[PDB]
Amino acid sequence: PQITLWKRPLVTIKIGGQLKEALLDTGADDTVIEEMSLPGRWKPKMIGGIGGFIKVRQYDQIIIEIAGHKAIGTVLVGPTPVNIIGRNLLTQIGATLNF
Amino acid sequence: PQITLWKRPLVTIKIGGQLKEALLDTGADDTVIEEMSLPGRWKPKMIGGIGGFIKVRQYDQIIIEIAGHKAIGTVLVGPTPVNIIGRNLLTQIGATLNF
């Protein structure tokens, strides 16, 4: 698809058997999801933006379906105010910014 | 251009006659720039990011060039970790997300 930016580029994702709404975010290096359970090993991480840092759990090799496209990569889980799909997964679905 | 996302989508901007580096950020409603001098009166705004809220100064109708594309619009000035070009100006330069 071609997604205009008049409003927030929100899409439905499937992660860990759950449906969530998430923001397609070219300004995010990594994908950050609100608190949920994911299988496998994890390690703690601090990530920072406007307003400072939050502590998250880093899960690797997680499969996500993003607007119908499957991708695998790292997902950070923690107290983010919005679910964010970052570049680490946007690349896998072939997303580009065009102007 | 067509910008892939394997690296951060950084561009050069020109604001107040000076060149700066900024991130093309589809996850940002607003454009937020590090502390600098801008003309005219400003208005208060509170914006919420991943780590909480910060106060910024809102300047309207500011002339700004983004990767060579001319825009005129609202610029927020404050303690952002990086200069971010948000959807208010990404729409002015005709940017879409594509996959």
Ligand SMILES: [C][C]([C])[C]N([C][C]([O])[C]([C]C1=[C][C]=[C][C]=[C]1)[N]C(=O)O[C]1[C]O[C]2O[C][C][C]12)S(=O)(=O)C1=[C][C]=C([B]([O])=O)[C]=[C]1
């Ligand atoms: C600031 C950017 C450089 C990095 N962020 C990504 C942005 O797209 C962020 C995404 C976002 C959106 C809503 C609420 C909270 C955050 N938007 C953002 O702050 O917008 C502000 C300006 O306009 C307003 O509209 C939206 C909020 C206001 S981040 O979330 O901090 C981040 C940092 C590190 C990592 B990591 O993987 O290390 C991943 C993500």
Ligand SMILES: [Cl-]
């Ligand atoms: Cl990854």
Ligand SMILES: [Cl-]
């Ligand atoms: Cl104020």
